[PDB]
Structure 1
Amino acid sequence: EVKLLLLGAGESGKSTIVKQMKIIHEAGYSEEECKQYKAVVYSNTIQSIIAIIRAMGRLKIDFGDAARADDARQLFVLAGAAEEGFMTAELAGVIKRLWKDSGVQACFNRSREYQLNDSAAYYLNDLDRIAQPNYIPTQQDVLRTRVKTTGIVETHFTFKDLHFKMFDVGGQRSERKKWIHCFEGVTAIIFCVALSDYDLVLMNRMHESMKLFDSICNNKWFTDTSIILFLNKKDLFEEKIKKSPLTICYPEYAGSNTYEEAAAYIQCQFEDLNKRKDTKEIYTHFTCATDTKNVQFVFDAVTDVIIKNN
Structure 2
Amino acid sequence: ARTVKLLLLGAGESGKSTIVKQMKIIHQDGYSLEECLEFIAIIYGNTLQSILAIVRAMTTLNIQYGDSARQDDARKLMHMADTIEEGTMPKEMSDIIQRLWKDSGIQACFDRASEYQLNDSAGYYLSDLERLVTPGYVPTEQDVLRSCVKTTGIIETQFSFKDLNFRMFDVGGLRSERKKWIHCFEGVTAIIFCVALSDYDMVLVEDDEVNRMHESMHLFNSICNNKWFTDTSIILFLNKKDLFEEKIKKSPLSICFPDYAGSNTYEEAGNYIKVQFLELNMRRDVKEIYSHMTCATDTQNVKFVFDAVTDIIIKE
Report the residue type matching 2:214 in the other structure.
Answer: H
May I ask how many residue pairs the two structures share in their alignment?
309
1:95 equivalent among 94, 97, 105: 97
Q: What is residue 207 of structure 2 aligned with on the other side?
A: none
Distance in structure 2 (CA, Å) of the matches to 1:180 and 1:140:
34
1:226 matched to 2:228? The reply is: no
Secondary structure of the corresponding residue to residue 284 of structure 1:
strand
CA contact (8 A) 2:153 2:172 kept: yes
Gap change, CA 1:155 and 1:129, over 3 Å in 2: same
Gap change, CA 1:125 and 1:17, over 3 Å in 2: same
Q: What is residue 245 of structure 2 aligned with on the other side?
A: 238
Distance in structure 1 (CA, Å) of the matches to 2:43 and 2:256:
31
Q: What is residue 57 of structure 1 aligned with on the other side?
A: 59
Distance in structure 1 (CA, Å) of the matches to 2:262 and 2:36:
43
Cα deviation for residue 207 of structure 1 reads 0.8
Distance in structure 1 (CA, Å) of the matches to 2:50 and 2:42:
12
Report the residue type matching 1:103 in the other structure.
Answer: G
Distance in structure 2 (CA, Å) of the matches to 1:227 and 1:205:
21
Distance in structure 1 (CA, Å) of the matches to 2:77 and 2:190:
45
Report the residue type matching 1:219 in the other structure.
Answer: N
Secondary structure of the corresponding residue to residue 102 of structure 1:
coil
Distance in structure 1 (CA, Å) of the matches to 2:229 and 2:167:
17
Query: Over residues 195-231 of structure 1, what are the superposed CA-to-partner deviations in whole Å (9 max), with x where a residue is unaligned?
Result: 1101214431111011111112122221122211111
More helix by share: 1
Cα deviation for residue 93 of structure 1 reads 1.7
Distance in structure 2 (CA, Å) of the matches to 1:59 and 1:283:
42
1:183 equivalent among 172, 177, 185: 185
1:206 equivalent among 204, 213, 219: 213
Distance in structure 2 (CA, Å) of the matches to 1:193 and 1:171:
11
Secondary structure of the corresponding residue to residue 26 of structure 2:
helix
Cα deviation for residue 178 of structure 1 reads 4.2
Distance in structure 2 (CA, Å) of the matches to 1:224 and 1:76:
55
Q: How does 1:72-151 map to 2 (within 5 A)?
A: 72-151=74-153
CA contact (8 A) 1:233 1:289 kept: yes
Gap change, CA 1:28 and 1:219, over 3 Å in 2: farther
**TM-score, structure 1 as length reference:** 0.93
Report the residue type matching 1:236 in the other structure.
Answer: L
Gap change, CA 1:3 and 1:66, over 3 Å in 2: farther
1:32 equivalent among 31, 34, 41: 34
1:257 matched to 2:270? The reply is: no
Distance in structure 1 (CA, Å) of the matches to 2:225 and 2:315:
21
Distance in structure 2 (CA, Å) of the matches to 1:31 and 1:24:
12
Cα deviation for residue 174 of structure 1 reads 4.5
Secondary structure of the corresponding residue to residue 281 of structure 1:
coil
Distance in structure 2 (CA, Å) of the matches to 1:109 and 1:281:
40
Q: Which sections of structure 1, spanning at least 5 residues, go unmatched?
A: none
Which is further off, 139-148 or 13-22? 139-148
Which is further off, 143-152 or 10-19? 143-152
Query: Over residues 102-141 of structure 1, what are the superposed CA-to-partner deviations in whole Å (9 max), with x where a residue is unaligned?
Result: 1112211100111010111011122121222322222222
Q: What is residue 273 of structure 2 aligned with on the other side?
A: 266
Report the residue type matching 2:213 in the other structure.
Answer: M
Q: Which sections of structure 2, spanning at least 5 residues, go unmatched?
A: 205-209
CA contact (8 A) 2:171 2:177 kept: no
1:287 matched to 2:289? The reply is: no
Distance in structure 1 (CA, Å) of the matches to 2:245 and 2:173:
31
Distance in structure 2 (CA, Å) of the matches to 1:89 and 1:224:
58
